[PDB]
């Protein structure tokens, strides 16, 4: 499971969740790539049993897509919470998401929980940004 | 400019700081790449005025290199402060360091400063890791 395959599964999962199905055309446009590039990855994903090529994810692909979508959202929340400009959050998440261990993700999970459970901590963090 | 050029500059900068000079052989071995690849990059770097081909960094290459080493250091401190297993930290930094805007880097800098001025915060976060 390379970062590119992950990106595709993340995208396919999202499309299925949003529209109810994933068309190579929708994937190609969503990733801003050529449909051939997409056709090649889909076949690779099929071979690896993440999906069945009417694009359907196997239980294996759903678990992964779900984890990948969860990781993306958590990473945006993380950067949002620490005060990163909203417009820059998405691009940063896209480039780092597929390069972090689960250990890092889980610890970032606890960090987000840390600030979300007590707003006083968010206020203190903001203070430091001013100093 | 480029995530790869950035990786070389960071490496060249480190070698100059450690040894006082940077050898193609030391670069090729540090990046785990063939000396030919390196030779091609250094020439690209020279054209762009980051250095002069032993090889010397120009004021532009030094400033960049210094920043990159700072970012690497901070990211490792970041992940360490939040509890990531040490063995996992280096590889995570290496893969996300060249994909974060300065905005994110600076906000992480404040986050690190936040946990540094009060151990109670570190302990509180550590608790959540138990929950
Ligand atoms: Mn992605
Ligand atoms: Mn994403
Ligand atoms: Mn690097
Ligand atoms: Mn580095």
Swiss-Prot record, chains A, B:
Claim: Transcription is one of the keywords in the record: yes
Binding locations of Mn(2+) 2: 10, 72, 94, 97
Role this protein plays: Central regulator of manganese homeostasis that regulates the expression of both manganese uptake and efflux systems. In the presence of high levels of manganese, it mediates repression of the manganese uptake systems MntH and MntABCD and activation of the efflux systems MneP and MneS. Binds with high affinity to the regulatory regions of its target genes. The manganese concentration required for activation of efflux is higher than that for repression of uptake.
Subcellular location(s) per record: Cytoplasm
Protein origin, superkingdom: Bacteria
SMART domains found in the cross-reference section: HTH_DTXR
Subunit structure of this chain's protein: Homodimer.
Binding site for Cd(2+) 1: 7, 94, 97-98
Domain HTH dtxR-type: 1-58
Main localization (coarse): cytoplasm
Any GO molecular function: manganese ion binding
Name this protein carries in UniProt: HTH-type transcriptional regulator MntR
GO biological process: intracellular manganese ion homeostasis
Pfam families to which the protein is assigned, alphabetical: Fe_dep_repr_C, Fe_dep_repress
Keyword Signal recorded: no
Signal peptide extent: none
Organism: Bacillus subtilis (strain 168)
Family: Belongs to the DtxR/MntR family.
UniProtKB keywords: Activator, Cadmium, Cytoplasm, DNA-binding, Manganese, Metal-binding, Repressor, Transcription, Transcription regulation
InterPro entries, A to Z: DtxR_MntR_Metal-Reg, Fe_dep_repressor, Fe_dep_repressor_sf, HTH_DTXR, HTH_tscrpt_reg_MntR, Iron_dep_repressor, WH-like_DNA-bd_sf, WH_DNA-bd_sf
Amino acids binding Mn(2+) 1: 7, 94, 97-98
Disruption phenotype: Null mutant is very sensitive to manganese. Mutant also displays increased sensitivity to cadmium.
